[PDB]
Each structure stands twice: as structure tokens, then as C-alpha cells.
Design an enzyme around this catalytic site. Structure first.
Site, PDB file in Angstrom:
ATOM      1  N   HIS E  47       0.818  -1.185   0.000  1.00  0.00           N
ATOM      2  CA  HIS E  47       0.000   0.000   0.000  1.00  0.00           C
ATOM      3  C   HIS E  47       0.857   1.242   0.000  1.00  0.00           C
ATOM      4  CE1 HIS E  47      -2.114  -3.032   2.611  1.00  0.00           C
ATOM      5  NE2 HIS E  47      -2.891  -2.970   1.543  1.00  0.00           N
ATOM      6  N   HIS E  49       1.049   4.473   1.904  1.00  0.00           N
ATOM      7  CA  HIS E  49       0.630   5.116   3.138  1.00  0.00           C
ATOM      8  C   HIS E  49       0.871   6.619   3.038  1.00  0.00           C
ATOM      9  CE1 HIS E  49       0.110   1.440   5.785  1.00  0.00           C
ATOM     10  NE2 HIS E  49       0.457   0.970   4.600  1.00  0.00           N
ATOM     11  N   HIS E  64      -3.257   4.223   5.283  1.00  0.00           N
ATOM     12  CA  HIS E  64      -3.279   4.237   3.830  1.00  0.00           C
ATOM     13  C   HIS E  64      -3.610   5.616   3.304  1.00  0.00           C
ATOM     14  CE1 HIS E  64      -4.313  -0.341   3.722  1.00  0.00           C
ATOM     15  NE2 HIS E  64      -3.151  -0.077   4.289  1.00  0.00           N
ATOM     16  N   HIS E  72     -11.324   1.055   2.662  1.00  0.00           N
ATOM     17  CA  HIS E  72     -10.286   0.197   2.118  1.00  0.00           C
ATOM     18  C   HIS E  72     -10.869  -0.783   1.117  1.00  0.00           C
ATOM     19  CE1 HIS E  72      -6.566  -1.950   1.901  1.00  0.00           C
ATOM     20  NE2 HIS E  72      -7.226  -3.082   2.074  1.00  0.00           N
ATOM     21  N   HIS E  81      -9.049   3.029  -1.052  1.00  0.00           N
ATOM     22  CA  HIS E  81      -8.091   4.101  -0.827  1.00  0.00           C
ATOM     23  C   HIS E  81      -7.229   4.282  -2.065  1.00  0.00           C
ATOM     24  CE1 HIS E  81      -8.269   2.582   3.582  1.00  0.00           C
ATOM     25  NE2 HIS E  81      -9.206   3.489   3.389  1.00  0.00           N
ATOM     26  N   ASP E  84      -4.397   1.788  -2.105  1.00  0.00           N
ATOM     27  CA  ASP E  84      -4.756   0.369  -2.046  1.00  0.00           C
ATOM     28  C   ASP E  84      -4.279  -0.360  -3.294  1.00  0.00           C
ATOM     29  OD1 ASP E  84      -5.798   0.681   0.368  1.00  0.00           O
ATOM     30  OD2 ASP E  84      -7.909   0.676  -0.265  1.00  0.00           O
ATOM     31  N   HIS E 121       3.591  -5.249   3.371  1.00  0.00           N
ATOM     32  CA  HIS E 121       3.085  -5.742   4.642  1.00  0.00           C
ATOM     33  C   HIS E 121       3.463  -7.192   4.850  1.00  0.00           C
ATOM     34  CE1 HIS E 121       0.568  -2.407   6.153  1.00  0.00           C
ATOM     35  NE2 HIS E 121       0.639  -2.036   4.888  1.00  0.00           N
ATOM     36  N   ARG E 144       4.499  -4.179   9.141  1.00  0.00           N
ATOM     37  CA  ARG E 144       5.129  -3.428   8.056  1.00  0.00           C
ATOM     38  C   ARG E 144       6.610  -3.772   7.985  1.00  0.00           C
ATOM     39  NH1 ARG E 144       2.408   2.544   8.789  1.00  0.00           N
ATOM     40  NH2 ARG E 144       0.276   1.780   9.137  1.00  0.00           N
TER      41      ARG E 144
HETATM   42 CU   LIG Z   1      -0.744  -0.863   4.618  1.00  0.00          CU
HETATM   43 ZN   LIG Z   2      -6.451   0.907   2.170  1.00  0.00          ZN
END
Ligand SMILES: [Cu+2]
Ligand SMILES: [Zn+2]
Ligand SMILES: [Cu+2]
Ligand SMILES: [Cu+2]
Ligand SMILES: [Cu+2]
Ligand code: NA
Ligand code: NA
Ligand code: NA
Ligand code: NA
Ligand code: NA
Ligand code: NA
Ligand code: NA
Ligand code: NA
Ligand code: NA
Ligand code: NA
Ligand code: NA
Ligand code: NA
Ligand code: NA
Ligand code: NA
Ligand code: NA
Ligand SMILES: [Zn+2]
Ligand SMILES: [Zn+2]
Ligand SMILES: [Zn+2]
Ligand SMILES: [Zn+2]
Ligand SMILES: [Zn+2]
Ligand SMILES: [Zn+2]
Ligand SMILES: [Zn+2]
Lengths: 154, 157, 155, 157, 154, 154, 154, 154
Positions: E47, E49, E64, E72, E81, E84, E121, E144
């Protein structure tokens, strides 16, 4: 670091690209050519001529670039014009791709060839060993089927 | 040793537009005098003429890249402070499609680190809006349209 | 929906007045009306929405033109303009200016709302971003800020 | 909508030099305030700190490229008119090799077309000669040496 | 022709590069990843962020990137997002190389992700179909192990 | 630990505030200026002068505070007066807001600048590089449109 | 071998003589100046300018002689114009006598300064260290009170 | 083939020459200026004013030559006075040398500018874009430090 390119063409079917790369003024310049449409199985002169002037075709490029006031020679000769890149070798299809490392040609500084002209000639460069005045000037490499101005490349 | 530099771009491309653009600069401190002699363009027209960054014709006039812009400005008129070095405005064509003209420019140099030697003159298909068009493209290219002719600025005798 | 706002402008000057805003929905154009007095006569004077509704240091603390889309300064009708670029108002022989126009970027509703930001009436003419210098593409070279007012919610 | 921008570069590399360089800019028209908190450097030293053009760490700090120079200047001191945007001069390290300081800069922006968001802070191994070294390298890099730590300038909360 | 790159690392053996190319603000952004050191034969969330802040490691990247205030989801969902990017597929060696064309991510303009963070992730993104509040926020993609700030590339 | 402030004014429209903060005697002093009413788009000298004496306007501030007996220089120079804060930069409206970290100026101990004078000058500080005796004394920064005594702020 | 001299004068009271001797092309050139009528106790730039053209006074001399395409610097700098001879020092009477060699100035060969111009400037050469664009062109040495064409001496 | 020249001077140190040449009435006129003594690094208006009358200095030249009844503009504008030559650019020494090709100015026929006046202004021409009445008349280029009557040169 510095990159340049000449796209050559003229009153002929000879075309192609000549690229130049030089890291710093004192470094060698790597010169690559990719030429098509020439005579097959031939040795053909390729020189840097002084003027990037195409006003009257390849003739206005003037003579070989010779800032150091030497006689015409082979690239390997101490006594050579800066612009003396010797003969390129054409294959059975009249094409010539090659790379050379040149220790005189600069893209940086007062003798930069940027803005000058690459000429691909119709004949073989005699490398200054022809034993006449013309050999010591041009290598007797014949007329100028294609030329292009050396421009700054990305 | 001679300080004076003369240069010329002989322009052509995928069009009937041809001609020559000459440059002369007496010293690094002097303005550059630019002379154009263009034929084969549209008649009675204003046509953008610019110096583009690269003297690369490998892909035709497209590979000349954008306007020469060492000072990081937006596109403008030659008289503007906020202009690209390469912004030479428009040339005027006559009833035959020809343009002869001469002007100096105070940003274009042949000598020194901002030299345009080895860069490209492009004669455009359209009119340069001089950065006054009110859109982002105006401040990049002047909306001057495609590139019927170009040539690398080469050293002249 | 149906949001109304008003800025009452004043400053280190005799320029005063009212600028009203109405917007039916977020995507609708905002209708802007100004009624300005005390300015130079027979003049073109820039009027902009500046970013901050901060009057702690007079009109200077309003900051630059409201520019949430990150564009350069232009005319209201330009694609390449700040949201706050409302161009010039025209003052009459008495230094007064009444007018109304919509704007398609100024919003009272939603994330780019100008409620709580500032209307500035400038001392000089907005060159609409056509001045050919870097300042033209920031401020329009419209000069100092004789009057400003925070855009507030109206009844 | 918030105009204020805060950013931070967290620097590290093939060295013990680490730390953070924060940037805050209230509006496009305001100077940017820069704060550094560097540890692990040489003690009692002046060390060049610059913004380099690319936020590319693919080959370590070398991939950041040269000093960020959108205006096409030569290398200088922060107070010089003729300087790169990225020319933030030297930081001072104390007896423990730590440097904490804060200054504004009038060319570095976080907002607008010359934003340094996404570019790189490099903390150098040597001293920036501020473009006063008398050689071509001085006017490019300040002769500040290699790049023991760098970080991409990223948006902060 | 804006290009960006994130070089990711963290408190793990997961490393690699994530590149971004976008022609213009309205054009899609092409995203390429080249990740090594992850779990083998796995689906791993990736993702963008919000914060390009690595002060406290990958935790400082925040949530995110969600400028449009959506829940999400998967990259293919309307309700997702901006950040995403769904799951990347790791091979038998724990490596993942891939390319996607993303129709929300921008490198240009107010929603640009330049200066934000790519996080790889530890777990699988449930794409907002986990049925809990966390699913609609993070996809339950776990910790993470690696992150990197999206920087401007040449 | 110590905070100080000078509010500058004089025979001009230049006004503003210069603040000083120093944690301890060996710590750098952080100096912040917020100046209005100066020439636009200009470089203007700002120095700490020895005397907090305004009996005859900014002239009675005397010369640059120079307890260590150096020549006039830029803040970055080893050979500089303690009071040499270099040039501030004014914006298009003649305003200058900035912060610097100074490694010589102290608010604590025998070389404290508390009770001395900040002068904002009318011209550009040549930073001691003007090549004449005045450059090495004053930087040739011109007259003194505004000044204020550095006072204890907390 | 080769000896040359410039007799300088112009729209000023500054006059004098600058002599040059060079034994061979690669040798340093010995330069001696004997200047009178200048400002007293001053540093004044003295440069070789490109043109030996006095048709419009010293302005016609053009810029600093710069055949190697460098920026302006001090004589000792690698990055300098050939004509960058720095400052002369004038005594209490406005006179300056001195001698130095220079390793770039030549009287022999293609970069010969014979027929070019010595300019004695009104102000101080900042040696390329001024931090502005003009410093890297002229040294900000001001106008040209005297100049003279470099001529062959017996 | 007509050639003209104006030698400009006035209540100032601005002097110089402006030359004009025109092959035929319908041909463009090439205008060259060589101006000295102006403000350095500046944009200064230069116009052809109606009257070659210097009885009251440059004031008696009257307004911009405007035989076609247009508003003041830039040379590039459709809506411009014939006399609107825009801004010249002065160098660091206050000199301006330039050439332009003008498509409205004539030396031949009823709109000839022979016997009219070139005025070099003290300020910048706003090119008709200043947004006031004066802008559309004069460009707000300020007073008239120098002027000269356009005279036949061959
Ligand atoms: Cu994430
Ligand atoms: Zn997201
Ligand atoms: Cu040849
Ligand atoms: Cu002072
Ligand atoms: Cu006039
Ligand atoms: Na070789
Ligand atoms: Na060279
Ligand atoms: Na031949
Ligand atoms: Na030519
Ligand atoms: Na020029
Ligand atoms: Na040259
Ligand atoms: Na009031
Ligand atoms: Na502003
Ligand atoms: Na921060
Ligand atoms: Na610094
Ligand atoms: Na799935
Ligand atoms: Na601060
Ligand atoms: Na400092
Ligand atoms: Na030499
Ligand atoms: Na006079
Ligand atoms: Zn040869
Ligand atoms: Zn342009
Ligand atoms: Zn605006
Ligand atoms: Zn730099
Ligand atoms: Zn001092
Ligand atoms: Zn020089
Ligand atoms: Zn006019």
C-alpha cells in the site's frame, strides 16, 4: 556524461546515426556508428569535418576538423586530424555498425566537436599513406554521400 | 584565436518547410544576432521558431526535446523576463510562405556554458501564443503545434 | 447545499465593502457579488481569494492566493489559474465597484471551501498572469492589499 | 484543506551517520524552515548538507544525482545569489559528532513547481567549500566529498 | 513522464524497489515492484501510506493514503483508498516482481503520492472484505516489514 | 534557557523583531527575524553592534560587536565579528522572515549580546570580501534604517 | 624570446605600462606593471581582455580573454580566464609597481595575447568568489579607466 | 533600398544610434540600436514618436507615431502603434545593442518614419498591458532621457 549524436544523410542512400559519449574533457570519447545504404563489403572513410554547416549539402562541412594542425592520418596515428576516424567496414548489405574509443575527439572544451559534422565518404580513406598532398589532407576518401551535424543528445 | 562565433541551422523535416537560421555572436558578453530565411511554410502566417534542447534528430524533430531552458523558466515571449532561452517567438511568413528576418536575442548564446551550439532550431506548424494562452501547455510550448522542420545549430565558417 | 457567505473588507485604506458568495451545491458555480467603495476611480483592481482567514497582521497574514490545485496565477477564465483568481473589478468615477459573476472553481461547500479564507481587494491591476515575469504567475502583480475580509457564513 | 506543508528526510547510508532533517513551509510565498538532528558524524567538523535532485536510493546515495538546481545556477553558499536550490551549506558537528540546528532557506520550497518533496537530503563526508574553491568541481558540488547518509524528503503529518 | 521510485526496507529481510511512471495527471500510473526476502508462495499487501515519514520506522508512515475518503478495498474496487495496491504474489523464493496499471494513483497534482510511503506488509490484504472495521481501514494486512518514501526518479 | 528579543525601528519604515534563544553558554544561539518595510527583493545586512545605546539613534550603537578582535566576515567565516549575521533576504514586499543558527553569538556569559543592538542595514553586506578596509570593518552595508536593543524576553 | 608591452590610458587619470616577456610557448609569461594615477591604497583588477580594439575606448576590448571557456577566477585558480591576472595594489600615491609570472598568459602560439588588451579596472576583482553570476564573468571589478593594446616590444 | 539613422541624446547620459533599413515599402524594416549610458540590467521603452521636433527637447516629439489609430502595444501585437518598438534590454553597463525586424515601420511611402523621432525612455514599456488609460497610450515607460530625429543615412 556528455552525449552527442549526428544523424547523417545526403545526396545518396547512405543514412544512419553516429553517437558520441565522453565522461570528462580528458577522457576518451566513445563513438558508435550505425550506417545503412552504403556499398557492400567496403571500407569507407568517416570523418569529423570542421563546420556544422549544411547550407550547401555536405560540401559546406569544410575540411577535416584539425584544431591541432596535423596531417591527415589513421585514428591510431599520432599525426592525425582530430576528425580522422578512419574507415568503417560495411557488410554484405552495405551496413556498418561499430564502436571505437577515440583519444583525441572531445565533446567538452575548446576542441569540442559538438556542432561540427560527421561525413561518411564514398571511398576508402588511405589514412594519409597515399603519398600525395591530397592524402595528407583528406585521405582521398572521395565525395560525401552523407553527413550530419553533431548535436547534443539527452 | 577568434572569439567570434557563427553558427547555422539548416532546417527540414516531414514537410516542405526548409531554410536556414544563422547565429552570430561577437563575444560571450554580446547579444546573438539571429537571421532566418525560411521557405515553404504557410502563407501570411505567424509561425513559432524556437531553440529546442537537443540536437538529436534520430526520431525526426521530436527528438529535439523541449525548448532549451537552462534557467528553469516558463515559456514566454522573447521580450519577457520569464521565458525559455529557446523562446524566439514567431516568424512572419509572406504571401508565398517565405520568411526572412533578423533580430538579436539577449538570452541565446553561442559562447559559454549556455551555448546553443549543437542544439536544435525548430520551425513550428502553428503560432506561438508567447506563454499568454492561459493553460499549462502555453507555459511549456506556447501551443505552437508540431515540428515541420528542424535543424541542428552547427558551427559555421 | 444552498450555502451563503460574505466578506466585509477593510484595511489600511479607505477601501471598504462587501463581497457575497452563494453556492447551491458543491459542483455548482459560486455566485459572487461585490459592492466596494473608496477605491481609486476609473480603475481595474485585482480581487482575489487568499488562502488564510488570518487578519493578525492586517491583510498580509491572508497569505498568497488560494491555490489548492497547485496552479500558476491566471485569469478566472483560464485553465491554469489559482482558485482564488477572480481577476479585476472595475471602479467607476467615484471609486465604487458593484458587480456580480459566477466562478466555476470557487466553492463554499466541500474540501476546497473558501469559507474561512480571505477576500483581498488589491491596490493595483491584476495582470491575469500575462505579465511575462515570475511575479505575474504568482500574484498577477496586483500590488498591495488595501482591504480584506474573512469569508464568513451568512444567514 | 491545509496549505502548511511539513516534510522530513530520515538519513542513513553506508556509514554511521543518521538523523533527521525536517522542513516546514507555511505557504508557497514563505521561506522554508529546516531543522537537522544528525548523529554519528565526524566530531568538531563542518559537513556539507544538500538537497539532491532525485529521491532515488536504488543504488544508495549516489542515485540521488546532483544538487537540486531547477534555476540552472552554479554551486554556492546559501546566502549567495548564484547557488543551487539544494545548497544548504555546512552543518557543524559537536565533540560527539552530532549536529542540531535550524535555519530557514529562501530558495527551498515544499510547495509549488520547485518543491523538494520527493528529492533527497545528502549529508556529506566532507566540507562544502561553498563554491569558493576555484575549480570546476567547487562550482558543481562544493568539493564536499562522498555521501555517508541520505534520505528522501517525505511528507510529514 | 513523471517517474518516481521507493526503495523499501525495514525491520525485516524484505527489500526491493517500487517504481511509478505517469504520463500526465489524468493518465494511469504504471507501478512496478521488485521485492525480495518475503515469505514464499504468499499474498502480501502493498500500500501507499500517507506520510513519507520514517522517523519511527514504517509505523511513521501512518495510514493508507486516502485523499478521497473512501473505505479500504482492492485496486479494482470503486471504493478503495488511493494507496490500495492490493496483494503482490511472492514466488517460491520469497520474491515478487510485477507491474500494474493504477487508475487512481497520481504522481502529478494535489493527490500526488510523491513523498508518501510504499509499505510492503507482512500479511495478506483482505481487500476490505474482512467484515470488520479494521478490514475497511487496513485490509488486516499485518505489520510493516519494509517501507520506503516515494522519491522523484530521473 | 535564555530568550532575548530586539524590536527594531529607526529613521525609516523598517521595523520588526529579532529573537534569540540559547540553551546554554556553549550552545548555538537560534536567531529569528521578522522584518517589514525594507527594500523588496534585496539582500540587507543585519548585525549585532556593540552598544545598546540609542541616545543618538542607530549611530550610537557603535560598531560591530567584535569581542574576539576579528575582521568582518560572513557568519560562515572563521574570521568574523560575533555580530556578523550576514545578509537577510527580503521578498517582493520588502519583508524578511528567517531563522539562523549562530555558533558565535551568545546570550549567556561574558560575551553575551544581551543589551547590545541589532542593526538592520540599508544595503548589502559584502561579507568582508569587498577588497577595501571598510569591507573588513563593516561589510559596506550602508546606513542603519532600524535598530533595537537586545532585551531579555523571559 | 618574445617581449610585449601595453601602454594603458583611458577616460581617467590612470596611465602606465604593463610589460610581458615569455621565453617559450610553454614557459610562464613574466608580467610587470608600472601604473600611476589610480585610487590610493586600493586593490584594482587588471585583466587581459579579448580584443585589441580601442575604437570605442576600453569598452571595445570586450570581455576577459577566455580561449579555454572557463569562468572568472583568481590567477591561482584552475577555473579562471586566461586574462585573469587578479588585482594590483596601489600605494598611498595611487601608484602600483609589481611583477609576477602567469602560467596561462602566453605571447607565443595560438593563445597569444599579443594584440589583445590590458585593462586596469576602477574597482576590485572579487576573483570569482563573489557568489553572483557577474563574479564568474568579470569579478565585479567595475569600469575600465585605462587600457592598452599588447604590442610587440623590441 | 532606404537607410535611416537617429542619433539619440537628451537631458541624460543616454546616447546612441538607431538605424533603420528597408528594401521596399512593403518589406519589413530592420532596426538596429546601439545605446549607452542607461540603467544597467533593465528593460527600457523605445518608441518612434510622431514629430521630429526637438525645439522643446524630447517633449516636442509628441506622442507615439500612430497613423493607424491603434492602442499602444508590444511590437508583436496586432493592436500597436507603428512607433511601438517595445523594450530594449540593457546589460550590466547600461548598454543595449540589438536588432529587430519590424513589420509595421516604414521608411518609404506615406507612413514613413523619416523625420520622426526615436525616443529612448527612462522606464519599462508595459506593452499596453498595464490596465490603465496611460498604458494604452504610452505603455507607462516614463520620461524621455534621449531622442533623435530619424534622418536619411545614404
Ligand atoms: Cu498498509
Ligand atoms: Zn487501504
Ligand atoms: Cu572527410
Ligand atoms: Cu552594521
Ligand atoms: Cu515613448
Ligand atoms: Na582510438
Ligand atoms: Na576540448
Ligand atoms: Na575525401
Ligand atoms: Na552563420
Ligand atoms: Na545573447
Ligand atoms: Na566559443
Ligand atoms: Na481603515
Ligand atoms: Na503572496
Ligand atoms: Na517534519
Ligand atoms: Na548551513
Ligand atoms: Na484476493
Ligand atoms: Na524558526
Ligand atoms: Na551560522
Ligand atoms: Na593558456
Ligand atoms: Na546631454
Ligand atoms: Zn583528416
Ligand atoms: Zn519556450
Ligand atoms: Zn492567483
Ligand atoms: Zn550545489
Ligand atoms: Zn562585522
Ligand atoms: Zn576573468
Ligand atoms: Zn505606443
Amino acid at each position: 556524461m556528455v552525449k552527442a549524436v549526428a544523424v547523417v544523410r545526403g545526396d545518396s542512400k547512405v543514412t544512419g546515426t553516429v553517437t558520441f559519449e565522453q565522461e570528462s574533457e580528458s577522457s576518451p570519447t566513445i563513438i558508435t556508428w550505425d550506417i545503412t545504404g552504403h556499398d557492400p563489403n567496403a571500407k569507407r572513410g568517416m570523418h569529423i569535418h570542421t563546420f556544422g554547416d549544411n547550407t550547401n549539402g555536405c560540401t559546406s562541412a569544410g575540411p577535416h576538423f584539425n584544431p591541432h594542425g596535423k596531417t591527415h592520418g589513421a585514428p591510431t596515428d599520432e599525426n592525425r586530424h582530430v576528425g580522422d576516424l578512419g574507415n568503417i567496414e560495411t557488410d554484405a548489405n552495405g551496413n556498418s555498425k561499430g564502436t571505437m574509443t577515440d583519444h583525441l575527439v572531445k565533446l567538452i572544451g575548446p576542441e569540442s566537436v559538438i556542432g561540427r559534422t560527421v561525413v561518411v565518404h564514398a571511398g576508402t580513406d588511405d589514412l594519409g599513406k597515399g603519398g600525395n598532398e591530397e592524402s595528407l589532407k583528406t585521405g582521398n576518401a572521395g565525395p560525401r554521400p552523407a553527413c550530419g551535424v553533431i548535436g547534443i543528445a539527452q
